[PDB]
Amino acid sequence: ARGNEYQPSNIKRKNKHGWVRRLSTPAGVQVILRRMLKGRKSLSH
Amino acid sequence: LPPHYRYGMSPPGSVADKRKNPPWIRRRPVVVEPISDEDWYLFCGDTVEILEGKDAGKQGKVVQVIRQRNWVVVGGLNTHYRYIGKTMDYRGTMIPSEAPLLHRQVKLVDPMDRKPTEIEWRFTEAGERVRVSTRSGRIIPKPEWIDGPKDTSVEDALERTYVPCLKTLQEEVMEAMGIKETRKYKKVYWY
Amino acid sequence: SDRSIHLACTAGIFDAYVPPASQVSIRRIKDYDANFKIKDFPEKAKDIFIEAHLCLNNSDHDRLHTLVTEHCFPDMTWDIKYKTVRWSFVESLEPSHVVQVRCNVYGQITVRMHTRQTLAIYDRFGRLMYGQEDVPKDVLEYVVFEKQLPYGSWRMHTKIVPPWAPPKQPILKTVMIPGPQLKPEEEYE
Amino acid sequence: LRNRVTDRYFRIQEVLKHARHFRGRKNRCYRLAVRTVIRAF
Amino acid sequence: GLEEFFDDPKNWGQEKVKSGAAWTCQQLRNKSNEDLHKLWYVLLKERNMLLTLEQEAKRQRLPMPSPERLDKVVDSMDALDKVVQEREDALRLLQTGQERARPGAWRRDIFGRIIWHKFKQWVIPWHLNKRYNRKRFFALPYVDHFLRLEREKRARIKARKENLERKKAKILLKKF
Amino acid sequence: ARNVVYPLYRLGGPQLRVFRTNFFIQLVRPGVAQPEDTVQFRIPMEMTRVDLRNYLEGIYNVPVAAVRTRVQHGSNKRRDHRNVRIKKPDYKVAYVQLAHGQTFTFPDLFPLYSMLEEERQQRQSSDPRRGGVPSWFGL
Amino acid sequence: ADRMSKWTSKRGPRSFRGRKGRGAKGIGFLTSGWRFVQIKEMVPEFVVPDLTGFKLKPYVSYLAPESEETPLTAAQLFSEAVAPAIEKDFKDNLEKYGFEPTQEGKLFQLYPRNFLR
Amino acid sequence: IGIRLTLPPPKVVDRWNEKRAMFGVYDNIGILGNFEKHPKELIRGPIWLRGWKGNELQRCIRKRKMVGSRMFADDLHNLNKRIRYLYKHFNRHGKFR
Amino acid sequence: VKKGFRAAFRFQKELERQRLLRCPPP
RNA sequence: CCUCCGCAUAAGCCUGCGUCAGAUACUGACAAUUAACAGCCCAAUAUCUACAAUCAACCAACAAGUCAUUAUUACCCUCACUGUCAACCCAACACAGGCAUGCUCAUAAGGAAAGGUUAAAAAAAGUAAAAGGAACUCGGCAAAUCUUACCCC
RNA sequence: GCUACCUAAGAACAGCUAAAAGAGCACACCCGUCUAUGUAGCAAAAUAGUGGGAAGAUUUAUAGGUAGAGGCGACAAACCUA
RNA sequence: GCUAAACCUAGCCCCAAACCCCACCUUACUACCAGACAACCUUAGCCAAACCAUUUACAUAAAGUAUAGGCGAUAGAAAUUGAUGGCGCAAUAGAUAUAGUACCGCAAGGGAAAGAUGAAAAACCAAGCAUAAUAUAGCAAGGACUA
Ligand SMILES: Nc1nc2c(ncn2[C@@H]2O[C@H](COP(=O)(O)OP(=O)(O)OP(=O)(O)O)[C@@H](O)[C@H]2O)c(=O)[nH]1
Ligand SMILES: [Mg+2]
Ligand SMILES: [Mg+2]
Ligand SMILES: [Mg+2]
Ligand SMILES: [Mg+2]
Ligand SMILES: [Mg+2]
Ligand SMILES: [Mg+2]
Ligand SMILES: [Mg+2]
Ligand SMILES: [Mg+2]
Ligand SMILES: [Mg+2]
Ligand SMILES: [Mg+2]
Ligand SMILES: [Mg+2]
Ligand SMILES: [Mg+2]
Ligand SMILES: [Mg+2]
Ligand SMILES: [Mg+2]
Ligand SMILES: [Mg+2]
Ligand SMILES: [Mg+2]
Ligand SMILES: [Mg+2]
Ligand SMILES: [Mg+2]
């Protein structure tokens, strides 16, 4: 019954975890900064 | 090349080299003393003498130089024997294969004295840089086509058609080819 | 590939001495060396042959590589690996003498030797499989030596076997030669 | 790992030698051989 | 014609095709702008032919005859481009004094990193461009801590590299 | 041209001209049956079909009747020893139909060792009668 | 769910796939009814020269002298182009010698560059 | 099996290199030099523990006091946490009280 | 690898003893 | 013999049973999906736009409803770009699960329940059963039939 | 991106009885009454049968919104990425 | 005799010194249209006080002194004084790091493993088993015994 909570959709993906949304708020800017400091190959989604 | 790549007898880009050093090898690096480019004194074709190992004393001709590992390969000297073309049935043919020698194990030979010599990179007024033997002086010299349908003749290649001018290639070509443009480029904003 | 393989021998004999004019080749040899003697060669060739076969007896590959060429060493050692050979030269019936000489540049000398030798080849387990350790046998052979013309020397290159050569000594063990391993569809002919 | 034990082989053998004539894993596994050897002594 | 995309029919199938030397920058510098303009298309046609040969060789699972001439042609085209760029740069410096052909400016991005923002071409001024105004070219105070952290990460990496180099040098000296 | 900023065009401005073309194309053998008048090219991704038409008509004087393009996706499934996907580059494929009834067919391109061969000829494989006894000895 | 793969026009719904491109420079605009108006002036015009009689083959003969590399500089260009006229008119208003006060009014403006390649 | 099967490469120690040969020299600089220099001034090392000794908590406190402002951000955070933990351990835990 | 020499030396002696036992000399 | 299906679009995925060669629905190489279908639109300033849909005709309504321009000024002179493959997606899996829409309403399309043997117990699913017919059981649970009447909430 | 509720603009509901019905039988579809199996399972809640609704307070695709001292809730202390 | 065993250097730790072409904020990595929207505002709590509620640390010497403090747990000055590498690690260690990669999660985020020939490749030892299943009786051993 459970397990399939991920119903993929690129519109939702980019509108929820995209670069633009991450930069929209100061908190998301700090999220991107944390990813950069850690060296993540994927800063945003 | 991958970090700490182990230079071998095979060239760094051959099939045998790729077989011996796949991308995932992490062998211990080889410790090689840092001989500067201005201190390297062994060159391809130089006559040398072997100081250590089998064939010690014999003098040969340097065929290959692996600088990254301070290696000189003396042609037909310091040879072991290996089979080439050995298949499931045929034993193959024995071939003499040279083994690399270190520049500390190999010394240059005087052009005429035919004896091992110590070398210095003494400057000369004419030969700005050239090898000079120390124990007996004398300079050791450094050893060592038809145009196709798609090759420029020498005179055409060296012809100086360039007349310097305050014109860009674009406008010069426009004048040469006769393209006439009257429209004025409207100014744009940069930011 | 700037570097190339530096061979120390040739693939095979230049001109085969068909067993029962070469002064140009002798001249070339002398102009390359300046101290060679055709008349004195046979003794040196015999010494080289005896030493090479004693090296085979003692499994001295290092000395073999100096006494025989790279076209000779595999032929001598491949089939004798993992077995012991008790070879011994007892005497030379008639004196050895040069026969034919021909010539980056190699020179080949054919020497006819009619000598007397002994053989005893044992298995991995020390079981005799060829010859007698003591009985001597008369052997007529044509050894072709070769030399490379700075640090080269005279080394055995080949052995020419006459088509009229007497059959070699028979083997101790019996042999089975399978016939055509026919597939089911195939039929014997 | 400034200081590490390098004699553990011999420390184990000092007991396994007395445990060699036992049955089962008591003659091979130190965790068992030590108990069996202590009981034997 | 399409035949210009392939080598000479006589050369077809040849194991090796002899080729001259790649054009050198000094040699090209002596040629006029029109001459360089024509040589550019000569080399472009040769490059197209050689790329066609390479792709067909890959398709046929065979080595490309004389692969070095493709590198020679690429080097010649690069040298011609460099010569033309040098002439254009010299003229631009003489006439305007600008060392860059494209306008740009050193700006601090939203992450506090100093970048060279290369200006784009627009029809309306920046104060009216909506998207440009959405783009932010300033770092707020909360970015200072991350700037310090990145600086310290870089310093740690550099210190590790230098210490390792000194260790290796000492090992080499002891060995020799 | 590619990897260059195009001068922005405003109404009534001058024609956009490129003097030293940066596009390099490949003429490739079609992988499937094609009409006699169709030629297949591999093109830089930044080249439009209009650009290809002008390119062929100016540099090669090839009369082009029609051009179609498609972006072939290169496989990203392959993985290296580090389990990182190796990306085969995507490339643009252009199908060009020649004009004036002209026909094109891809040309049929591609229409020490001595010592090794000599020794192989001189193998002298072992005789079964010998029963493994070495053949060098003449006794 | 794939973050390490490049974002291309082949990924996403119909709107995303239609909207994203592959780097090809624009040729015109869109009007009512999605009709595309292509502007000729926006199409790059390949200025291909006449190669007839051209003597420069793609490759150079190996029997050619080697010369030291001397990258062209502003000073060298000035010396080779303007200096002679300056000397002549000094022995005997820089626009006469060639200086252009402003790039505006030129078809090929050096800065900001407004021409291809 | 945690024992190597081959002897390790011989370890040769030059007992008469310069460092060992001149070790201890100028340790009596004070008493033999009119006390111009204290022997602790011969100590080369971290600035916060030159001629000074203490337990881990004291060493951490001294490090923070003397070079805390020059420490990296995460290193200083780690030092603060270590000082906190050492304070708690030394002032609230132990057999003796 | 564990730094040290004496344990390795002892193990070498034990290996020599085992080798002798397995292949006693004439 | 089965057919829940199936074929497309959407969404998702991203080359994931095409060819060649090596191995032992894998690996490497080669090839491929071609726009008309779909996405990617619209020059301004004002000014218009009461009267559902339901075969829209009678009727009946209530919950009161997806579907419209004009006036002047501008403006044509020049068909790009992107998706197009697959045995596919979300469920750690070649997962008996989840999965929108258009047709097909049993198929023209798509598939195989049995690796071979034997035919023990116990276990699961099903079928048949003398006479009896709830005597079972907490209870007619299950199964079989199609079955009345009275209460509590 | 599940789920609770909501916003925008969409889609689906065979056949029969009745007749403008939060009507009846009954598909698709939604749900999950009871039994059996399963219980490291096909499944971290399924399968087979059986059953409730199935023109509505229905179901459902897309995008958006409400965030933890909170949200949302036909209150089950429900649901808010097992 | 198979699984396997080992190995030495990849690097790292602590100090000193020293200050450090094009594309991309729209669905990032997207050539090319009227914006207007802009940042600052006490840390808290765990925990200790054996609960918890005020409270509870974040060069040397003066000095744990003056003081503060449910005057108790604890907190705590100032005046004043004068100020060149490694008895480090060596692949379960040392950085998480071969890498913030693979993989996992919608996301924030979490986060691995491992390699060893030689100058040149253009040359005997853990467990587990097998050799070799088993003989009445039993913490499997001890005393023993010819066994
Ligand atoms: N304590 C310590 N001394 C170091 C360190 N790095 C270098 N040194 C010392 O620096 C001195 C000079 O180092 P060298 O490499 O010989 O010379 P250099 O490159 O001129 O030195 P620097 O100026 O320090 O970079 C020697 O005494 C080294 O021991 C380090 O990390 N710690
Ligand atoms: Mg959903
Ligand atoms: Mg298309
Ligand atoms: Mg089956
Ligand atoms: Mg079965
Ligand atoms: Mg009955
Ligand atoms: Mg009853
Ligand atoms: Mg009844
Ligand atoms: Mg009863
Ligand atoms: Mg029932
Ligand atoms: Mg109905
Ligand atoms: Mg109803
Ligand atoms: Mg309640
Ligand atoms: Mg309750
Ligand atoms: Mg408390
Ligand atoms: Mg307590
Ligand atoms: Mg003070
Ligand atoms: Mg580690
Ligand atoms: Mg064992």
The neighbour count for residue E56, using CB atoms within 10 Å, is 21
* Inter-chain CB proximity F107 and E6 less than 8 Å: yes
Contacts of C43 (CB under 8 A, 6+ apart): C96
CATH of the domain at C16: 3.10.450.240
Domain count of chain B?
1
**Pairing mode of beta strands C137-148, C155-160:** antiparallel
For residues B75 and B61, the answer to whether their CB atoms sit within 8 Å is yes
Please list the helix, strand and coil fractions of chain D in percent, rounded to the nearest 5, in that order: 65, 0, 35
Nucleotides on chain K that have an atom closer than 7 A to a protein CB are 1-2, 43-46, 62-65, 81-82
Q: How many whole angstroms separate alpha carbon F64 and alpha carbon F72? A: 22
Q: How many whole angstroms separate alpha carbon E30 and alpha carbon E14? A: 35
State whether residue C156 is helix, strand or coil: strand
Q: What are the angstrom distances between the C-alpha of C49 and each of B166, C88, C144, E123?
A: 85, 11, 11, 96
Q: How many whole angstroms separate alpha carbon B83 and alpha carbon C66? A: 17
B90 Cβ under 8 Å from any chain F Cβ: yes
What is the rounded end-to-end Cα distance, in angstroms, of chain G? 40
Q: How many whole angstroms separate alpha carbon B187 and alpha carbon C122? A: 100
Helices H73-92 and H56-67 meet at what angle, rounded to 10? Answer: 150
Q: Could you tell me if residue F63 is left (phi over 0), alpha (psi between -120 and 50 degrees) or otherwise beta?
A: beta
Give contacts of H11 with chain I, Cβ < 8 Å. 5
Task: Return the exposure string of C86-119: e unless at least 16 CB atoms fall within 10 Å of the residue's CB, then b.
Answer: ebebeeeeeebebbbbbbeebbbbbbbbebebbb
* Inter-chain CB proximity E120 and B33 less than 8 Å: no
Contacts of B85 (CB under 8 A, 6+ apart): B92, B93, F116, F120
Nucleotides on chain J that have an atom closer than 7 A to a protein CB are 10-16, 18, 27-35, 38-43, 76-84, 89-92, 97-98
Please give the resolution of this entry in Å, rounded to 1 decimal: 2.6
Q: Which two tokens stand for residue B138?
A: 């004398």
**Pairing mode of beta strands F17-18, G45-46:** parallel
Residue whose tokens read 């952290």: E149
Cis peptide before G112 (omega within 30 of 0): yes
Shortest distance between the Cα of A3 and any Cα of chain G, in A, equals: 15
User: Which candidate, B91, B62, B94, places its Cα nearest to that of B78?
Assistant: B62
* Inter-chain CB proximity H74 and E145 less than 8 Å: no
- Is residue E170 in contact with ligand 1, taking CB distance under 6 Å? no
Q: Is C35 exposed, middle or buried, given 0-12, 13-18 or 19+ CB atoms closer than 10 A?
A: exposed
E40 Cβ under 8 Å from any chain B Cβ: no
Nearest to E142 among A23, A26, A37 (CB): A26
Contacts of C130 (CB under 8 A, 6+ apart): C119, C120, C121, C169, C171, C172, F133
- Residues within 8 A of G (CB atoms), E 39-58 only: 39, 41-43, 45-46
Q: Which residues numbered 67-96 in chain B sit less than 7 A from strand L, measured from CB?
A: 78, 80, 82
Q: Which residues numbered 8-27 in chain D sit less than 7 A from strand L, measured from CB?
A: 9, 21-26
* Inter-chain CB proximity F60 and E5 less than 8 Å: yes
Q: What are the angstrom distances between the C-alpha of E78 and each of E30, E35, G36?
A: 16, 16, 37
Length of chain H: 97
For residues F104 and F39, the answer to whether their CB atoms sit within 8 Å is yes
Distance H14 CA to ligand 7 centre (A): 105
CA of A7 to C1' of K47 (A): 25
**Pairing mode of beta strands B119-120, C84-85:** unpaired
The structural domains of chain A, with segments of one domain joined by +, span: 3-45
What is the rounded end-to-end Cα distance, in angstroms, of chain C? 53
Q: Which two tokens stand for residue E127?
A: 């104060």
Contacts of C7 (CB under 8 A, 6+ apart): B95, B96, C70, F112, F115
Q: Which two tokens stand for residue C46?
A: 């015999």
Atom 14 in ligand 1: residue holding the nearest Cα? E166
Q: Is the CB of A30 under 7 A from strand K?
A: no
State whether residue E133 is helix, strand or coil: helix
Q: How many whole angstroms separate alpha carbon F89 and alpha carbon F78? A: 12
Please list the helix, strand and coil fractions of chain I in percent, rounded to the nearest 5, in that order: 65, 0, 35
The residue type at G46: F
* DSSP state at residue F60: S
For residues E86 and E96, the answer to whether their CB atoms sit within 8 Å is no
Q: Which DSSP string corresponds to A11-45?
A: HHHHHHH-HHHHHHSHHHHHHHHHHHHHT-S-S--
- For testing contact with chain G, the best of B146, B150, B154, B189 (most G CBs within 10 A): B154
Give contacts of D6 with chain I, Cβ < 8 Å. 2, 4, 6-8
For residues F103 and F37, the answer to whether their CB atoms sit within 8 Å is yes
> What count of Cα atoms within 13 Å lies in the side-chain half-sphere of residue E116?
4
Q: How many whole angstroms separate alpha carbon E79 and alpha carbon E22? A: 9
Q: Which two tokens stand for residue D2?
A: 């400034």
Q: Which two tokens stand for residue H8?
A: 């390790």
- With vertex at residue H77, the alpha carbon angle to CA H71 and CA H83, rounded to the nearest 5 degrees, is 100
Distance A1 CA to ligand 10 centre (A): 28
Nearest chain H residue to D8 by CA distance is H2
For residues E8 and B149, the answer to whether their CB atoms sit within 8 Å is yes
Q: Which DSSP string corresponds to B25-76?
A: --PPPPP-----TTT----TT-EEEE-SSTTTT-EEEEEEEEGGGTEEEETT
- For testing contact with chain A, the best of G2, G3, G6 (most A CBs within 10 A): G3
Give contacts of H69 with chain E, Cβ < 8 Å. none
Q: How many whole angstroms separate alpha carbon H84 and alpha carbon B144? A: 73
CA F100 to chain centre: 27
For residues E26 and E82, the answer to whether their CB atoms sit within 8 Å is no
Q: How many whole angstroms separate alpha carbon A17 and alpha carbon C67? A: 79
Shortest distance between the Cα of B171 and any Cα of chain F, in A, equals: 10
For residues C3 and B73, the answer to whether their CB atoms sit within 8 Å is yes
Q: How many whole angstroms separate alpha carbon D4 and alpha carbon B35? A: 40
B182 inside domain: no
* DSSP state at residue E128: T
When computed from its CA atoms, the radius of gyration of chain F, rounded to whole angstroms, is 29
- Is residue E163 in contact with ligand 1, taking CB distance under 6 Å? yes
Q: What are the angstrom distances between the C-alpha of E171 and each of B32, B185, D14, E168, H15?
A: 11, 66, 41, 5, 19
Atom 9 in ligand 1: residue holding the nearest Cα? E166
Residue whose tokens read 């007497």: C166
For residues E31 and B162, the answer to whether their CB atoms sit within 8 Å is yes
Q: Which two tokens stand for residue F71?
A: 């972006």
Q: How many whole angstroms separate alpha carbon F139 and alpha carbon C88? A: 12
CATH of domain A3-45: 1.10.287.3980
Give contacts of A41 with chain G, Cβ < 8 Å. 4
- Is residue E118 in contact with ligand 1, taking CB distance under 6 Å? no
Q: How many whole angstroms separate alpha carbon D30 and alpha carbon E63? A: 63
* Inter-chain CB proximity G13 and A42 less than 8 Å: no
Q: Which residues numbered 30-49 in chain B sit less than 7 A from strand L, measured from CB?
A: 30
* Inter-chain CB proximity B188 and E34 less than 8 Å: no
- Residues within 8 A of G (CB atoms), A 6-45 only: 6, 8-11, 41-42, 45
Q: Which two tokens stand for residue F25?
A: 């194309």
For residues F129 and C152, the answer to whether their CB atoms sit within 8 Å is no
Q: How many whole angstroms separate alpha carbon B162 and alpha carbon E93? A: 20
Residue whose tokens read 């780690």: H78
G4 Cβ under 8 Å from any chain A Cβ: yes
CATH of the domain at F13: 3.30.70.330
Residue whose tokens read 């009014």: G105
Q: Which two tokens stand for residue F132?
A: 């493994």
Distance A5 CA to ligand 14 centre (A): 29
* Inter-chain CB proximity B22 and F19 less than 8 Å: no
Method: cryo-EM
The three-state (H, E, C) secondary structure of chain G, written as one string:
CCCCCCCCCCCCCHHHHHHCCCCCCCCEEECHHHCEEECHHHCCEECCCCCCCCCCCCEECCCCCCCCCCCCCHHHHHHHHCHHHHHHHHHCCCCCCCCCCCCCCCCCCCCCCCCEC
For residues C108 and C57, the answer to whether their CB atoms sit within 8 Å is no
Continuous H helices in chain C:
23-33, 41-58, 61-67, 73-77
* Inter-chain CB proximity I11 and H5 less than 8 Å: yes
User: Which candidate, B146, B62, B145, places its Cα nearest to that of B105?
Assistant: B62
State whether residue F71 is helix, strand or coil: strand
Q: What are the angstrom distances between the C-alpha of F131 and each of C131, C159, F126?
A: 14, 21, 9
The yes-or-no reply on G/C contact (3 CB pairs or more, < 8 Å) is no
CA of B185 to C1' of J94 (A): 63
For residues E152 and H72, the answer to whether their CB atoms sit within 8 Å is yes
Residue B102 β-bridge partners: B71
Contacts of B39 (CB under 8 A, 6+ apart): B121
The residue type at C152: G
B75 inside domain: yes
Domain that holds residue F68: 1-139
Q: How many whole angstroms separate alpha carbon G36 and alpha carbon G42? A: 13
Q: How many whole angstroms separate alpha carbon B124 and alpha carbon B130? A: 7
Length of chain B: 191
Contacts of G43 (CB under 8 A, 6+ apart): F16, F50, F51, F54, G27
Q: Is B98 exposed, middle or buried, given 0-12, 13-18 or 19+ CB atoms closer than 10 A?
A: buried
- For testing contact with chain G, the best of E8, E24, E38, E73 (most G CBs within 10 A): E38
Q: Which two tokens stand for residue G47?
A: 């200025």
The residue type at H12: V
Q: Which two tokens stand for residue E25?
A: 């920058």
* Inter-chain CB proximity F17 and G45 less than 8 Å: yes
Q: Which two tokens stand for residue F74?
A: 């290169």
